[PDB]
Design a protein around this ligand. Structure first.
Ligand SMILES: NC(N)=NC1=[SH]CC(CSCC/C(N)=N/S(N)(=O)=O)=N1
Ligand SMILES: [Zn+2]
Length: 256
């Protein structure tokens, strides 16, 4: 699977029938149809920069993974009773500035989107166990609006020249990804899925109302990562965003 004409989002259902399921992500958040939910607590993140582990070129994207053997780095609050353990963050982006985010807000497409993913360590003993459970994953998404260069992206951007081609990986340490979150954590929440195979309907989404910035030249660094292995002809990672999927009657809730 990928994001090409032949292996891309509109082909995924051939191998992953859940792609046409009832809790698929991302979605368009229509703000006139969201229902403010007064029981939603504030989102609380508390991450230890010592859990940051490694950065990896996974061919369609790159991931920054964290040690997840204990509760040094956790998400609590929001719609959750359980505490969720941080395991990764990564980005999605598009061919040009005009699209690139996965979620849209009232039809508006942003330039990129940051996903900070976590697994339910109150209920499950590993990411592998949690990843297929209805309540197993909690992902914060933050919409990225093209404009001013974002300095908090810096350590991440500087690391990519060491993982230029598919399968390359490098240590990436002492990094607290709450520094990338917008100053207000007001959010939307809905029940959905991983946005690429295997597309498990295991994700509680937490979408921030406030965007963060990214420059047109920062976006170019993402798109200059390569999806081919070292020594093959260079294939730029131009985009990795899935189109928005039908709500199928789920309700998007607002904390604000
Ligand atoms: N199979 C297995 N044992 N563990 C798995 S399968 C996918 C997975 C999460 S990695 C995160 C990749 C992703 N698509 N998340 S997103 N874009 O935030 O919806 N862990
Ligand atoms: Zn993602």
């Amino acid at each position: 699977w990928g994001y090409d004409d032949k292996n891309g989002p509109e082909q995924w259902s051939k191998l992953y029938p859940i792609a046409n399921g009832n809790n698929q992500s991302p979605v368009d958040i229509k703000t006139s149809e969201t229902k403010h939910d007064t029981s939603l607590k504030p989102i609380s993140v508390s991450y230890n920069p010592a859990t940051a582990k490694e950065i990896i070129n996974v061919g369609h994207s790159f991931h920054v993974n964290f040690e997840d053997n204990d509760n040094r780095s956790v998400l609590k609050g929001g719609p959750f009773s359980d505490s969720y353990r941080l395991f990764q963050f990564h980005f999605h982006w598009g061919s040009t500035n005009e699209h690139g985010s996965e979620h849209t807000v009232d039809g508006v497409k942003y330039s990129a989107e940051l996903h900070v993913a976590h697994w339910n360590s109150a209920k499950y003993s590993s990411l592998a166990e949690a990843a297929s459970k209805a309540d197993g994953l909690a992902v914060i998404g933050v919409l990225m609006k093209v404009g001013e260069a974002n300095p908090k992206l810096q350590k991440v951007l500087d690391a990519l020249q060491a993982i230029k081609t598919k399968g390359k990986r490098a240590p990436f340490t002492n990094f607290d990804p709450s520094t990338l979150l917008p100053s207000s954590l007001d959010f939307w929440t809905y029940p959905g899925s991983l946005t690429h195979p295997p597309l498990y309907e295991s994700v509680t989404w937490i979408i921030c109302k406030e965007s963060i910035s990214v420059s047109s030249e920062q976006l170019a660094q993402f798109r200059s990562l390569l999806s081919n292995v070292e020594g093959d002809n260079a294939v730029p990672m131009q985009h990795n965003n899935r189109p928005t999927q039908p709500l199928k009657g789920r309700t998007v809730r607002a904390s604000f």
